[PDB]
């Protein structure tokens, strides 16, 4: 029961790349079928591909008009990637999508990423007329990351997150504020080091109070999200980067999506340290990542074969960087990404990844009762014209299906399937008096 109670989530990068309501519905269908609990839909991730009906934003002592914010975001997204399939989901489409998922017992968790992976928002701010929103590192400007010294750019971004969080209030549980990979383009993936550097290496031109300002920013977004009754979530890499607790403390109410154990020269906090600090953890192990278009061995990092191997070899309970500690989890999340958003989206490949994650951790995933429900619906309603003996058999087989534990896992699917087969057999054996 502890296993089935955890979240099982599929994540889809619909920030970089357009996904239609139809495509997303198909993903929800498969998520439900395979025993998942939630769809994690990035809508702000480099591109920004979700537009509310009212996008007016009040910040910087004015209001930026809804139609101007919309045009600025559409344009800004296209400058990142002008997807021939579409630009953004509308509010009507999102509301319907959330309802469609809810009716299948699937939750939706959105991400609108900042202060990194926000290319489109930075573009949109410039189109509105806000100056120099981008972070720069010794003359190299980030296309993805806002400068936390820029009060006007920061105020706008916070007000945009508030606007989205207000929409998602009461229709979702968790809002992912992201926070991953600060200035990864401008700093060669050393952005957290750069933000912390001035404290330890002063008078060398590193950003003054960089990391301290990042903690304040993260905590302000957390406050914003919490005000709407949503649980804030964020990726782990910048949270106590280098295990450094001396700059300040992160809001404990931020759920940590633990996706990386770090790499050479990129020393992230262990999941042990994060749990000890009082954060709940969603295991988002990059062992299971799939980047669209990288479809076989040799086709690059996070290719489909690598992800399928990661799923086979790294269970849902194996969290990045545990230090050998027992790390509790709220659930696990397998993620598909669109780093090259011109890549073809292949539903079958995504569904293979999803199916493998479910099968490899089958005790955690809900069983499928849909065919059992259908089988019961197909039983002839009136049995009077059949022999007592053949009728009793059908009634007992029906009882057997209705008696199944309603909380079986995917590991126990055969119990359900055998019960369906028995009912079908007894119905075919009904004999006219
Ligand atoms: C908003 C919406 O379309 N809801 C439908 C639905 N959402 O998943 O599928 C159910 C069947 O599974 C239908 O009974 C619901 O009417
Ligand atoms: C939290 C996270 O996963 N961040 C990035 C990532 N960094 O290595 O890997 C993915 C796959 O390349 C990218 O799509 C993500 O934007
Ligand atoms: Mg650009
Ligand atoms: Mg009926």
């Amino acid at each position: 029961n502890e296993k089935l109670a955890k979240k099982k989530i599929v994540s889809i990068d619909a920030g970089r790349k357009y996904f239609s309501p139809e495509q997303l519905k198909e993903i929800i269908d498969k998520a439900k079928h395979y025993g998942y609990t939630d769809l994690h839909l990035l809508v702000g991730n480099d591109g920004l591909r979700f537009m509310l009906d009212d996008m007016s934003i009040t910040a910087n002592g004015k209001t930026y008009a809804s139609d101007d914010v919309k045009r600025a975001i559409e344009k800004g997204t296209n400058d990142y990637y002008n997807d021939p399939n579409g630009n953004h989901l509308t509010e009507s489409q999102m509301t319907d999508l959330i309802n469609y998922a809810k009716d299948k017992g699937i939750g939706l968790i959105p991400t609108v990423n900042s202060p990194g992976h926000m290319d489109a928002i930075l573009n949109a701010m410039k189109e509105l007329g806000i100056q120099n929103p981008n972070f720069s590192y010794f003359g190299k400007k980030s296309a993805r990351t806002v400068d936390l010294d820029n009060e006007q750019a920061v105020a706008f971004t916070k007000a945009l997150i508030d606007k989205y969080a207000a929409y998602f209030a009461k229709k979702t549980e968790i809002f992912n504020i992201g926070l991953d990979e600060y200035a990864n383009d401008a700093t060669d993936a050393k952005g957290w080091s750069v933000l912390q550097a001035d404290k330890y290496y002063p008078n060398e031109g590193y950003p003054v109070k960089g990391y301290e300002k990042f903690i304040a920013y993260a905590n302000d977004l957390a406050r914003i999200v919490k005000s709407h009754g949503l649980k804030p979530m964020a990726f782990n890499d910048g949270i106590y980067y280098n295990s450094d607790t001396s700059f300040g403390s992160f809001d404990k109410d931020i759920i940590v999506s633990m996706w990386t154990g770090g790499w050479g020269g990129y020393d992230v906090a262990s999941s042990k340290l994060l749990a000890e600090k009082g954060h709940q953890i969603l295991n988002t192990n990059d062992a299971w990542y799939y980047v669209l278009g990288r479809n076989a061995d040799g086709q690059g990092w996070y290719n489909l074969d690598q992800g399928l191997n990661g799923i086979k070899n790294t269970p849902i309970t194996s969290v990045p960087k545990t230090e050998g500690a027992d790390i509790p989890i709220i659930g696990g999340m397998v993620a598909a990404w669109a780093d090259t958003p011109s890549a073809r989206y292949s539903p079958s490949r995504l569904f293979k990844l999803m199916r493998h994650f479910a099968n490899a951790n089958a005790e955690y995933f809900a069983a499928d009762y849909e065919s059992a429900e259908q089988a019961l619906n197909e039983v002839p309603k009136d049995l009077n014209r059949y022999t007592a003996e053949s009728v009793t058999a059908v009634k007992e087989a029906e009882k057997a299906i209705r008696s199944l534990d309603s909380n079986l896992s995917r590991a126990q699917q055969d119990t359900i399937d055998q019960a369906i087969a028995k009912l079908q057999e007894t119905v075919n054996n009904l004999t006219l008096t």
Side-chain angles (χ1 to χ4, degrees):
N1 284 137
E2 289 158 304
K3 292 180 189 180
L4 282 161
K6 300 196 176 334
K7 292 197 160 299
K8 285 75 54 164
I9 310 181
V10 55
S11 177
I12 300 296
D13 183 9
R16 284 186 182 102
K17 183 177 179 50
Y18 181 82
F19 284 78
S20 72
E22 291 87 350
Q23 290 169 320
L24 294 172
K25 286 181 179 179
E26 181 178 43
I27 294 164
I28 290 157
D29 287 349
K30 295 286 168 174
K32 159 102 281 217
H33 186 65
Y34 297 149
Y36 287 75
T37 59
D38 297 274
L39 167 63
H40 176 267
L41 184 64
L42 296 99
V43 300
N45 189 231
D46 297 9
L48 176 56
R49 298 193 183 277
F50 174 44
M51 207 76 78
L52 309 170
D53 291 333
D54 171 25
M55 287 299 283
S56 60
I57 297 296
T58 298
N60 306 325
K62 67 181 69 69
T63 298
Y64 300 86
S66 177
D67 279 357
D68 294 333
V69 176
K70 295 177 174 186
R71 182 166 196 180
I73 287 165
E74 249 199 92
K75 185 168 177 193
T77 288
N78 287 336
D79 173 81
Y80 162 75
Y81 174 58
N82 194 332
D83 192 329
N85 294 328
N87 179 276
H88 61 271
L89 301 167
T90 62
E91 184 170 330
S92 292
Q93 294 168 339
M94 183 66 75
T95 292
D96 174 71
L97 192 71
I98 294 170
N99 287 338
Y100 183 89
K102 181 185 178 184
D103 287 348
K104 285 181 160 62
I106 298 300
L108 186 147
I109 302 171
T111 299
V112 180
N113 215 333
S114 74
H117 291 291
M118 59 174 299
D119 310 40
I121 295 162
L122 295 166
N123 288 338
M125 287 191 288
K126 285 178 278 156
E127 300 293 337
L128 293 170
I130 294 168
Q131 284 173 58
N132 306 125
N134 303 245
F135 177 80
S136 283
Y137 181 63
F138 293 99
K140 193 163 155 56
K141 181 167 296 184
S142 181
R144 308 189 179 134
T145 300
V146 68
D147 183 347
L148 299 171
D149 288 343
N150 186 322
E151 305 186 324
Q152 295 69 31
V154 170
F156 184 93
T157 302
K158 288 178 184 173
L160 184 63
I161 301 296
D162 189 45
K163 201 95 181 189
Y164 281 119
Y167 164 77
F168 288 112
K170 319 277 180 111
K171 53 170 72 68
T172 55
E173 300 177 322
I174 298 163
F175 185 108
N176 188 343
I177 57 171
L179 309 184
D180 58 315
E181 297 187 319
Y182 191 87
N184 66 333
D185 55 342
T187 66
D188 191 27
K190 305 302 181 185
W192 302 122
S193 294
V194 166
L195 284 183
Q196 293 184 343
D198 183 71
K199 178 176 192 160
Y200 299 115
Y201 305 95
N203 322 115
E204 293 280 13
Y206 297 117
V208 174
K209 299 198 298 184
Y211 195 68
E212 179 178 347
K213 288 185 177 200
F214 168 75
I215 298 177
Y217 179 81
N219 284 347
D220 212 28
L221 291 187
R223 179 190 59 74
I224 288 161
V225 169
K226 287 156 70 179
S227 77
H228 293 291
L230 299 168
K231 295 194 201 70
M233 180 160 74
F235 292 122
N236 67 282
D237 53 302
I239 310 181
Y240 304 114
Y241 180 85
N242 196 36
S243 304
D244 198 324
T245 61
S246 80
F247 291 86
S249 297
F250 290 87
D251 189 322
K252 306 188 171 74
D253 295 307
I254 299 169
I255 301 172
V256 174
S257 173
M258 193 85 189
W259 71 277
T260 188
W263 52 86
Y266 199 83
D267 303 302
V268 305
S270 61
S271 57
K272 183 186 191 294
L273 173 173
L274 299 179
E276 288 172 351
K277 288 299 223 165
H279 298 274
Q280 297 293 107
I281 295 168
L282 177 69
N283 186 6
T284 307
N285 206 313
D286 73 331
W288 314 316
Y289 274 14
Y290 164 46
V291 168
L292 268 41
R294 302 179 183 170
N295 291 343
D297 67 295
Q299 297 183 20
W301 207 248
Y302 305 136
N303 74 68
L304 179 66
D305 278 336
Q306 174 176 10
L308 293 172
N309 283 343
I311 287 166
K312 178 168 177 158
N313 292 304
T314 297
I316 197 168
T317 46
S318 182
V319 179
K321 201 173 181 169
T322 67
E323 290 190 67
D326 294 318
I327 306 304
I329 57 164
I330 70 171
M333 176 157 82
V334 55
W337 298 102
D339 298 36
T340 297
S342 65
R344 190 171 94 66
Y345 163 54
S346 170
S348 66
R349 284 171 177 93
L350 173 62
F351 302 153
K352 182 168 183 187
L353 189 86
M354 289 170 61
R355 184 167 67 250
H356 280 233
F357 186 58
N359 283 343
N361 300 289
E363 288 181 330
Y364 287 79
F365 283 75
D368 171 27
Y369 295 80
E370 195 197 7
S371 292
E373 301 193 23
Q374 186 59 28
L376 288 171
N377 296 337
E378 292 175 349
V379 179
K381 189 171 67 58
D382 306 340
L383 298 188
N384 182 46
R385 299 293 170 170
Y386 298 110
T387 64
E389 295 73 22
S390 68
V391 171
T392 304
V394 170
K395 300 312 287 170
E396 286 298 329
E398 273 188 309
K399 282 173 79 188
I401 291 172
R402 295 192 172 106
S403 291
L404 291 158
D405 191 314
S406 61
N407 300 297
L408 293 177
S409 78
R410 199 170 165 81
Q412 291 106 53
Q413 186 65 40
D414 285 346
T415 297
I416 298 163
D417 294 355
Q418 283 156 31
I420 293 163
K422 179 72 175 195
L423 176 60
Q424 292 173 335
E425 176 194 339
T426 60
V427 173
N428 187 237
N429 288 336
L430 282 164
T431 296
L432 288 169
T433 299

